[PDB]
């Protein structure tokens, strides 16, 4: 199955995220002790690129999905069958993946032609002048509760920085909910410590 192992490799490569808070109007949110946002469906949810050292040019960010329960690691993550034949197409994502990117017009979904896991790919941009981070906005198409996808399994998001001709320079992952309330959601799986 699709590694998961923290790597920073050369460039130092570490995810950060917005310290959002469990207030009640929160979107998006992301627990430090659990190393797991908390997101309401199709809702920007930005994830922070952090470098020690700016990657080569042709730089690629790819986001994938996995279940985290081992014996649910081999089945591929993807939107159920009600979402998929639904309307919410931004016309370039495919209508089955969970994870899109929002308001980048380079934006590249691929269908592994031997594995068939889904994922998402944009051209990686420094940072902002002013700035020590690159931010993505991702989207999750699919609520953790739809009882015909995910149905309420823990999945992981696999975030891989790879060079013009894909080869790995770094990986980090997060684990993800995708749920109505994300401010209560995390603190009530923070109340269990
Ligand atoms: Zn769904």
Redesign the pocket.
């Known amino acids: 199955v699709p590694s998961q192992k923290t790597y920073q490799g050369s460039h130092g490569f570490r995810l950060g995220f917005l310290h959002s808070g469990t207030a009640k109007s929160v979107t998006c949110t992301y627990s430090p002790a659990l190393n797991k946002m908390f997101c309401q469906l199709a809702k920007t949810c930005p994830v922070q690129l952090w470098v020690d050292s700016t990657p080569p040019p042709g730089t690629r960010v790819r986001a994938m999905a996995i279940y985290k329960q081992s014996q649910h690691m081999t089945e591929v993550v993807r939107?159920?069958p009600?979402?998929e034949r639904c309307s919410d197409s931004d016309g370039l994502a495919p209508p089955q993946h969970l994870i899109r990117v929002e308001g980048n017009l380079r934006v590249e979904y691929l269908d592994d032609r031997n594995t068939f896991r889904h994922s998402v790919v944009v051209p990686y941009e420094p940072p902002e002048v002013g700035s020590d981070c690159t931010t993505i906005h991702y989207n999750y198409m699919?609520?953790s509760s739809?009882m015909?996808?995910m149905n309420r399994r823990p999945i992981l998001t696999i975030i891989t920085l790879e060079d013009s001709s894909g080869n790995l320079l770094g990986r980090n992952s997060f684990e993800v909910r995708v749920c109505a309330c994300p401010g209560r959601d995390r603190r009530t799986e923070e109340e269990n410590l």
């Open positions: 939107r159920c009600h979402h699919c609520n739809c015909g996808g």
